[PDB]
Amino acid sequence: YDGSKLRIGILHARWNLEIIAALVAGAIKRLQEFGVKAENIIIETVPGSFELPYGSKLFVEKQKRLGKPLDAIIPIGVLIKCDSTTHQLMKLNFELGIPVIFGVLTCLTDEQAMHNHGEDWGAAAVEMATKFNLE
Amino acid sequence: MKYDGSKLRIGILHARWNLEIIAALVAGAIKRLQEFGVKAENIIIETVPGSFELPYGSKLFVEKQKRLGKPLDAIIPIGVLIKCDSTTHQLMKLNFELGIPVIFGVLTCLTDMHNHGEDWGAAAVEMATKFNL
Amino acid sequence: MKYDGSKLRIGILHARWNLEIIAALVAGAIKRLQEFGVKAENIIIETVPGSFELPYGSKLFVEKQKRLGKPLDAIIPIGVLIKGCDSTTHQLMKLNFELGIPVIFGVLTCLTMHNHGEDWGAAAVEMATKFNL
Amino acid sequence: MKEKFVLIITHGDFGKGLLSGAEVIIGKQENVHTVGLNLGDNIEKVAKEVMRIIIAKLAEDKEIIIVVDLFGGSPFNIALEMMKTFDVKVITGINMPMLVELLTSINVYDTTELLENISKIGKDGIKVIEK
Amino acid sequence: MKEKFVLIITHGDFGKGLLSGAEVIIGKQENVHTVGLNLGDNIEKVAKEVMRIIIAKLAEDKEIIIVVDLFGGSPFNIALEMMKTFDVKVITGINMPMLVELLTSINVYDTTELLENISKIGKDGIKVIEK
Amino acid sequence: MKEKFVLIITHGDFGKGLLSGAEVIIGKQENVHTVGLNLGDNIEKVAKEVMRIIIAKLAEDKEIIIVVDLFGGSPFNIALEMMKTFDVKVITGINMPMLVELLTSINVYDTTELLENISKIGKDGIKVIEK
């Protein structure tokens, strides 16, 4: 998948920041490996995972008003012992009209909560924005 | 220091069950709101009986504030539930239906706070500001 | 075998995680599809990374097939999830009504196969036929 | 060019032995799999086995070549059924010079030219020695 | 002005020692981190760690300055990669007068002027002494 | 040309770390020693130790270069006191490019030209990167 002509947004929460940062780093890494340019990877933050769904819409709308629309978005959150959240992010695919990659970890321990997992979300974003187009 | 809330109007809708805990969460939200510059004239507190009434109460609250000519920029529904899943779902959806940030201020605990409330205060200000133009 | 599938075009969208199991379920669906009379030119296989991408992948797949002038009559999203997803079952369910074609639930939700895949093949043909003209 | 995968489908241990032999010459292969039809194997069970492999490899974005021992017979019938459904490519009568050339040039030619190449090399490699 | 964070990236214990030395002079620092590239370190592993830190600090709304030991070499290559992706600022050839001036004026100047200041002070601080 | 000996005198672990870093690049050094002034060190005690090293090396017929971190401060004051008494040579503001060039050319140039060389290389090695 060629991602050179894509603009990808990453919206991440700020709780469990050490783990968050590594997942973002992984997503950023794999994005660039598929050809997505640095100017085209937009990182923005929200307080927590609850704010991810609506933050994503506001982020997408802002990027449209800037004349730099996102082709896909990766909402990243780390929740340690949310079900509704998976539901809004799922629905957001259809409401926003762009691929929303589920980047929320739902773990029971800190240990369970990474770079590889983040890369997976990077690869997914590029594929979902490309595979079904007319390229 | 980072988000200026001086030009914002923030609504707080809280339930009345578990009032002692409710009051402290409200107090925390009020505290952090004012720390980001949100004026007292602009913090509107209203109540509902229970957490179930929070979602629809929020819509009625938002609609009322529009008819008064004093629209809310964000809302914090606050509830304390002790051993609700649906309720979280409506508050989530309410972001998109009302067109303003709805901060999830519902505690879902197993046993019987100010900092937690402040977090919700900080969130409301940021979500109403960060993505504007 | 009471359902004639000769005039049908069936899409299969499968995830790539747990590939060995995925392949067998696809093979089963393909087998039963052809047993009802569905022609090879008319069985379209496409992939997504994981089960989460299945719902939106299905819409993009369906829209693409329309733009190609070769519309799908039904779709079978296939995923294997091991607890070693609840929302997903919900979107695939809703997708029946949003896409206007039968969406057969081909997602395994296990804790630790060909026949199961065939079942999904049989279902797709029946749901696309039984209630027609 | 997509990466290729070679599926060898033959009677008994022929494919398993042919690959072994080739590997003496050119080293251990990746992207080659063998399926043998033995007496007592149910052809429909083997067919579903083969289809499972093909789907898996297609899902890995691979281009598939099926090499078979004999024109006619159950292995061939399986290969044909896979070409009917999945548009893989098929060649029969596989011998050692063919397989060695195939595996050492698999990245050089497109599948059509590859198969024409090894067809020619396979036939040329069959010689009766006089004297 | 945003609060600044200084990342020191160098060969071996140079950054760790430089910070130690500076702290003898101006006391214990917050908002300074050191990363050393040792023989036997995989540069890509270190790069991912550094990116780990930068994202975390950006997410804290901090402005990042990367100081490096040597123009050229793996630490520099990491810093450059980070500038390509994250638009941090970078200066090479770090010495003691530079680091002390940097850390004691970090709140006074914007990053561009700060780096110009310490570049000048660093060069001026290198003197051969003849009496 | 006499064989040279390099004494690094700095605040805290700076010299110890700088040498470590250089050795990642050019391998383990002979004829380089580091002395660090820590909080709580008596400068006169450190001065006597440094003098203890210089005499020993002079007695080995070595030419001594003292490299120091910072113009001004106790390490510099020690170096100056050694130049007053023993006519060693001194350079301040040491950084990585300087030390690497110094240690890899120590046999090539006389001490005066060596110090001029590394002064130039040290200053040139300090660059703010824009882009």
Domain layout of chain D by residue ranges:
1-131
CATH of the domain at B130: 3.40.50.960
- Grouping H, G, I as helix, E, B as strand and the rest as coil, residue D27 is coil
Residue C99 class from Cβ within 10 Å (0-12 exposed, 13-18 middle, 19+ buried)?
middle
Closest residue, chain C, to D53 (C-alpha): C23
Q: Give yes or no for a contact between F7 and F94, defined as CB atoms under 8 angstroms apart.
A: no
**Among C89, B127, E62, F48, residue whose Cα is nearest residue A51:** B127
| Torsion angle of C-alpha atoms C75, C81, C87, C88, degrees rounded to 10 | -10
Resolution of the solved structure (Å): 3.5
CB contact under 8 A, A51 and B133: no
Cβ of C39 under 8 Å from any chain D Cβ? no
Within its chain, how far is the Cα of A57 from the centroid? 12
- Grouping H, G, I as helix, E, B as strand and the rest as coil, residue C69 is coil
The one-character DSSP state at A39 is: G
Q: Give yes or no for a contact between C64 and C31, defined as CB atoms under 8 angstroms apart.
A: no
**Which of C48, C55, C98 comes nearest A90 by C-beta?**
C55
Q: Give yes or no for a contact between E93 and F125, defined as CB atoms under 8 angstroms apart.
A: yes
Q: Give yes or no for a contact between D7 and D33, defined as CB atoms under 8 angstroms apart.
A: yes
**DSSP-derived secondary structure for A80-131:** E--HHHHHHHHHHHHHHSS-B--EEEEESSTTT--HHHHHHHHHHHHHHTTT
CB contact under 8 A, D52 and C23: yes
Within its chain, how far is the Cα of F38 from the centroid? 17
Q: Give yes or no for a contact between A14 and A48, defined as CB atoms under 8 angstroms apart.
A: yes
Q: Tell me how crowded residue F113 is: count the other CB atoms within 10 A of its CB.
A: 11
String of b and e for E45-78 (b: at least 16 CB within 10 Å)? ebbbebbbbbbbbbbeebbbbbbbbbbebbbbeb
CB contact under 8 A, B96 and A58: no
**Which of A83, A93, A127 comes nearest C55 by C-beta?**
A93
Q: Which residues of F touch E37 (CB under 8 A)?
A: 24
CATH-assigned architecture of domain D1-131 = 3-Layer(aba) Sandwich (3.40)
Task: Choose the mutation target among A106, A132, A133, A135 for the interface with C, i.e. most C CBs under 10 Å.
Answer: A132
CB contact under 8 A, A55 and B127: yes
- The vertex-B132 CA angle with A47 and E86, nearest 5°, equals 60
Alpha helices in chain F (DSSP H): 14-26, 43-58, 74-86, 96-104, 111-124
Q: Give yes or no for a contact between A53 and A85, defined as CB atoms under 8 angstroms apart.
A: yes
**What distance in Å separates residue F47's CA from the closest CA in chain E?**
18
Q: What is the SS3 assignment for chain B?
A: CCCCCCCCCEEEEEECCCHHHHHHHHHHHHHHHHHCCCCHHHEEEEEECCHHHHHHHHHHHHHHHHHCCCCCCEEEEEEEEECCHHHHHHHHHHHHHHCCCECCEEEEECCCCHHHHHHHHHHHHHHCCCCCC
Within its chain, how far is the Cα of A91 from the centroid? 15
Q: What residue ranges in chain D does DSSP mark as E strands?
A: 4-11, 32-37, 63-68, 89-91
Q: Tell me how crowded residue A108 is: count the other CB atoms within 10 A of its CB.
A: 9
**What distance in Å separates residue C25's CA from the closest CA in chain D?**
9
Which C positions 47-106 lie with beta carbon below 8 A of chain A? 48-50, 52-53, 55-57, 59-61, 63-64, 67, 86-88, 90-91, 98
Taking each helix axis as running N to C, give the angle between helix D74-86 and helix D43-58, from 0 to 180 degrees, rounded to the nearest 10: 40
**What distance in Å separates residue E85's CA from the closest CA in chain A?**
5
**Which of A51, A58, A59 comes nearest B123 by C-beta?**
A51
Cβ of E28 under 8 Å from any chain F Cβ? no
Cβ of E80 under 8 Å from any chain A Cβ? no
Which A positions 24-53 lie with beta carbon below 8 A of chain C? none
Cβ-Cβ pairs closer than 8 A, A with E, add up to: 34
Closest residue, chain A, to B90 (C-alpha): A84
Cβ of D104 under 8 Å from any chain C Cβ? no
Which A positions 53-82 lie with beta carbon below 8 A of chain E? none
C71 beta partners: none
Half-sphere exposure of residue B50: CA atoms within 13 angstroms, side-chain side: 5
Cβ of E94 under 8 Å from any chain F Cβ? yes
Task: Choose the mutation target among D44, D51, D53 for the interface with C, i.e. most C CBs under 10 Å.
Answer: D51
Measured between alpha carbons, how far is B47 from B41 in angstroms, rounded to an integer?
Answer: 18
Cβ of A115 under 8 Å from any chain E Cβ? yes
The H or E element containing residue F33 is strand F32-37
**Among E11, E59, E15, residue whose Cα is nearest residue E33:** E15
Domain span at residue C48 reads 1-133
Interchain touch E–D (≥3 Cβ pairs closer than 8 Å)? no
Measured between alpha carbons, how far is C122 from C5 in angstroms, rounded to an integer?
Answer: 10
Measured between alpha carbons, how far is E65 from A134 in angstroms, rounded to an integer?
Answer: 43
Amino acid identity for residue E126 in this structure: I
CB contact under 8 A, F126 and E123: yes
Q: Which residues of C touch A131 (CB under 8 A)?
A: 46, 48, 57, 60
**Among F5, F2, F3, residue whose Cα is nearest residue F89:** F5
CB contact under 8 A, D85 and C34: yes
Residue B66 class from Cβ within 10 Å (0-12 exposed, 13-18 middle, 19+ buried)?
exposed
Cβ-Cβ pairs closer than 8 A, C with D, add up to: 35
Measured between alpha carbons, how far is E8 from A135 in angstroms, rounded to an integer?
Answer: 44
Residue indicated by tokens 């008064």: B68
The length of chain E in residues reads: 131
Q: Which residues of E touch A118 (CB under 8 A)?
A: none
**Which of A58, A83, A87 comes nearest B131 by C-beta?**
A58
Measured between alpha carbons, how far is C26 from A89 in angstroms, rounded to an integer?
Answer: 28
Q: Which residues of D touch C50 (CB under 8 A)?
A: none
Q: Which residues of F touch E10 (CB under 8 A)?
A: 21, 96
Q: What is the SS3 assignment for E7-69?
A: EEEEECCHHHHHHHHHHHHHCCCCCEEEEEECCCCCHHHHHHHHHHHHHHHHCCCCEEEEEEC
Measured between alpha carbons, how far is A72 from D48 in angstroms, rounded to an integer?
Answer: 38
Cβ of C18 under 8 Å from any chain D Cβ? no
Q: Which residues of C touch A87 (CB under 8 A)?
A: 87, 90
**DSSP-derived secondary structure for C16-57:** STTHHHHHHHHHHHHHHHHHTT--GGGEEEEEESSGGGHHHH
Half-sphere exposure of residue D58: CA atoms within 13 angstroms, side-chain side: 23
**What domain count does chain B have?**
1
- Grouping H, G, I as helix, E, B as strand and the rest as coil, residue C6 is coil
Measured between alpha carbons, how far is F9 from D79 in angstroms, rounded to an integer?
Answer: 79
% helix, strand, coil for chain C, step of 5: 50, 20, 30
Measured between alpha carbons, how far is F85 from A20 in angstroms, rounded to an integer?
Answer: 59
**Among E13, E45, E2, E25, residue whose Cα is nearest residue E99:** E25
**Which of E59, E84, E85 comes nearest A21 by C-beta?**
E59
C-alpha gyration radius of chain F? 14
Amino acid identity for residue B60 in this structure: L
Cβ of E42 under 8 Å from any chain F Cβ? no
Contacts of B among chains (3+ CB pairs under 8 A): A
CB contact under 8 A, F129 and E91: yes
